[PDB]
Design a protein around this ligand. Structure first.
Ligand SMILES: [Hg+2]
Ligand SMILES: [Hg+2]
Ligand SMILES: [Mg+2]
Length: 307
């Protein structure tokens, strides 16, 4: 079976999240969605750094054409951070847009660029809760003239995103729905339609909640299972097909990104935050970062945001 390695060099995270693999610099970036920190890991050189801000963060993606600059979330603001990748604070912050200026207790959560470079991201109540809590989030993309467009409402916990290689489908996760949805994606108008369930956890006895996700070159989705101690591999060719399961020692698996020189090493983030209604005792909940090899598939380099 696959080899799951705990990356000792990286330590433990409250809620490690938002992994992004920059292929040209062979560097993984990620966030902690509770501790207000960004993180950098260069595996070939065993280099780790962090960056502190005073707002809640949920993604970090290099800005296309601008070395040393990243598109990030700061509470409800999408912003450009100028960061040298090693100092413990940004050099400067350039706000782009506040997606929800008048929803004082919302935050941005998972975000990713589509293959064309357009940032997609969604919101949630800061005090969202599972299985039931306030449902206040929406799904957006950032388009022309730095204005967002809304694509879906009634989202409890806005989470993982992926697109098919032919640019005809988008895949999206609201953790509260305990399923992955597929949509027809119109790359020319940047709109989605014909929402329908692709994979429903209760139909397959999968515990926990879908969180982050990514897609491989064959079109398989790799889905993080929060409170499931696993990642799952699911089909995009047929609905409701579980292809494989890979157990991850940390119960609170949060997200996934392919990396390594050949894009065949799956980085997996997790959360050490101990929750009062957990299916797992506290001794099990640590928050390490893992690397999975031997899956027999390759992914894609992380896409930079175009502004
Ligand atoms: Hg930073
Ligand atoms: Hg940054
Ligand atoms: Mg997430």
């Amino acid at each position: 079976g696959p080899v799951v390695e705990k990356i000792a060099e990286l330590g433990k995270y409250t809620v490690g999240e938002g992994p992004h693999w920059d292929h040209e610099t062979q560097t993984l970036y990620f966030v902690d969605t509770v501790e207000k920190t960004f993180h950098k890991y260069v595996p070939s050189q065993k280099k780790y750094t962090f960056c502190k801000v005073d707002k809640l963060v949920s993604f970090i993606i290099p800005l296309a054409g601008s070395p040393g600059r990243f598109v990030v979330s700061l509470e409800r603001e999408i912003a450009i951070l100028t960061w040298d990748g090693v100092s413990a604070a940004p050099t400067s912050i350039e706000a782009i847009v506040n997606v929800e200026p008048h929803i004082k207790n919302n935050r941005l959560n998972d975000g990713k660029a589509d293959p064309l470079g357009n940032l997609w991201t969604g919101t949630m109540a800061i005090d969202a809760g599972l299985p039931i809590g306030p449902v206040t989030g929406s799904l957006y993309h950032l388009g022309a003239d730095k204005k967002v467009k809304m694509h879906e409402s009634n989202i409890a916990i806005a989470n993982g995103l992926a697109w098919s290689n032919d640019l005809k489908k988008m895949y999206y996760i609201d953790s509260g729905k305990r399923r992955v949805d597929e949509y027809d994606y119109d790359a020319s108008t940047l709109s989605i339609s014909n929402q329908r369930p692709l994979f429903t956890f209760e139909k397959h006895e999968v515990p926990g909640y879908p969180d982050g996700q990514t897609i491989d070159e064959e079109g398989n989705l790799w889905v993080a299972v929060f409170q499931g101690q696993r990642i799952i591999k699911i089909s995009t060719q047929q609905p409701e097909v579980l292809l494989d399961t890979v157990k991850i020692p940390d119960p609170q698996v949060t997200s996934v990104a392919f990396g390594g020189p050949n894009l065949d090493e799956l980085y997996v983030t997790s959360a050490g935050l101990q929750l009062d209604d957990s299916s797992f005792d506290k001794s099990l909940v640590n928050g390490h970062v893992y690397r999975v090899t031997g899956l027999g598939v390759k992914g894609f380099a992380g896409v930079k945001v175009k502004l």
